């Protein structure tokens with residue numbers, strides 16, 4: 001099983017994250033990619049290749065052009081405005097605001113952000129483009145006939161919506177991969193988001209689209225980030241009617257419960273007729289994850305990968321979250337073992 | 342004229358404000374009230390009295406009850422959740438989010454916030470209630486027949502909307518005062534917001550109401566906080582049709598230009614038939630203000646107060662912003678000299 005990974009993830013090495021009212025070093029840090037890469041190699045997945053670079057063709061079909069233009073120059077503009085910290089939004093277009101886009105950097109960073117814990121730092125845009133490239137090359141392997149591949153994306157993607165960054169995410173890698181599979185000839189694709197957090201960005205991108213089914217298992221947004229999307233009642237609008245499926249779950253959820261939601265999501269995906277599944281894999285569902293409240297064990301990730309692959313359709317696994325301990329690597333490698341076994 | 346002021350403002354003494362990606366000492370600090378009080382006394386306004394306390398009768402008519410309940414316990418809940426810094430929102434209900442209210446403190450602080458530079462700290466709620474009380478007692482003096490009074494509010498109020506805090510504000514003191522005047526028998530009231538920043542909170546509270554005319558002169562929101570309201574096209578909705586008037590202005594605006602907008606706003610207020618005007622007075626229009634881009638001089642504040650009082654209707658002056666230098670006091674005192682002269 002080929003692993004696509006760019007060393008350019010390291011260009012995002014942000015100094016700060018707003019957490020508990022303090023500016024602390026970020027949870028989503030380069031050591032994550034080091035730990036995951038080492039563990040997948042240790043598990044025998046040593047066919048590791050860098051992605052080819054890609055321009056914006058595919059990503060323009062899932063993200064707004066203004067948003068992408070904003071990300072490309074955000075750091076330069078923040079620095080030119082004289083601010084001394086990293087680029088962190090403060091004002092947001094919340095209830096009953098104007099829809100207009102501000103012109104200056106402080107207004108625009110808020111316009112284009114859903115979550116202020118995520119700072120833009122020098123190298124962020126380049127890192128995000130490299131992470132997108134890993135997702136695109138992974139998709140191309142699936143399009144060309146492989147039944148499994150792993151895109152070791154960093155930074156992650158699933159909180160990036162049509163025109164907003166947040167939750168450590170800038171470009172929605174999984175969305176780009178799904179779009180790439182459609183562009184290569186698929187008519188129906190599913191994204192299955194097993195990260196602890198709701199993929200609100202992914203949901204947003206496809207909410208009014210019927211070509212990509214979106215399923216997410218996650219901490220209940222009533223008491224988990226991203227807080228403002230991910231309820232079970234959200235099933236899609238217009239052309240997207242019936243193609244969003246959210247499975248919010250509570251504190252302490254173990255695999256015996258979580259796996260029942262996985263089974264149901266896979267039934268939904270099969271009834272939709274997905275030609276391939278892009279798996280948004282976060283391992284922050286782990287019982288020792290520092291920011292999450294599920295209780296999956298390391299062996300459960302093998303079961304998970306096996307069950308998803310038993311769909312009998314090709315899988316692209318795209319890396320999302322999972323923090324704090326190097327066992328994030330074991331957990332990811334275990335999903336791949338379940339897929340490959 | 343009487344000056345209403347509570348020493349309980351000092352219960353808000355937050356340690357941090359997110360500015361330029363750093364946590365810095367807040368601009369809206371207790372020493373402001375000290376500077377202002379000393380200067381007004383120096384100018385001969387020494388009839389200074391503490392407000393009587395007030396319950397929530399008036400404020401419940403302009404703010405949402407869930408919002409007020411949230412503010413009352415926000416600090417305690419944040420601390421109980423184990424966070425080490427002051428209480429600062431990071432996730433926000435922005436474009437295309439669920440309207441649902443989260444249950445936990447992190448979700449709720451974002452739900453009820455429009456701007457993350459403002460941290461909730463111990464004593465914030467009590468301070469905000471004392472500031473509201475100063476506004477209510479000021480309104481009561483006007484209702485009883487005084488032609489002018491000054492409510493030395495701190496914390497300020499004009500960024501607090503129906504159900505959101507931000508911009509250093511928690512309870513919209515000016516909105517509470519206007520409501521109090523209606524409750525005491527007025528049928529039409531105006532709020533005139535001359536602080537540099539758009540009073541988006543005030544606008545929100547009255548946008549669909551026809552009993553309170555709202556006029557604001559301010560830095561253009563395309564390039565100034567609050568960024569997402571304050572455009573000239575916003576003239577009201579429903580019962581509030583035609584009773585919001587915004588005058589956005591650009592960098593370097595001096596009194597020769599700003600005063601023309603003031604004249605127009607007073608024309609609008611007179612045609613509406615306001616029985617009294619609540620003046621949201623920020624002196625962050627000053628040429629030295631550290632966070633603002635207008636160029637008013639200290640003598641211009643006398644002109645401003647005279648012009649507003651030449652409306653010939655009673656005024657309640659309610660303190661908003663103005664930062665950095667002790668001359669904030671001279672500037673406030675000069676508005677009062679213009680009113681009283």
Ligand SMILES: NCCCNCCCCCC(=O)NO
Nearest residue numbers: 117167195197225282291321
């Ligand atoms: N108790 C608060 C935990 C941190 N809250 C915001 C972090 C964003 C997490 C994004 C992520 O990992 N997404 O997959």
Ligand SMILES: NCCCNCCCCCC(=O)NO
Nearest residue numbers: 508509536538566623632662
């Ligand atoms: N360049 C950033 C300067 C600070 N930006 C937002 C501060 C909030 C000001 C609120 C205020 O003073 N309202 O009257």
Ligand SMILES: [K+]
Nearest residue numbers: 193195197217
């Ligand atoms: K998820």
Ligand SMILES: [K+]
Nearest residue numbers: 534536538558
């Ligand atoms: K104003």
Ligand SMILES: [N+]
Nearest residue numbers: 206209212243
């Ligand atoms: N969808």
Ligand SMILES: [N+]
Nearest residue numbers: 547553581584
């Ligand atoms: N209004």
Ligand SMILES: [Zn+2]
Nearest residue numbers: 195197282321
């Ligand atoms: Zn996650």
Ligand SMILES: [Zn+2]
Nearest residue numbers: 536538623662
């Ligand atoms: Zn101001």
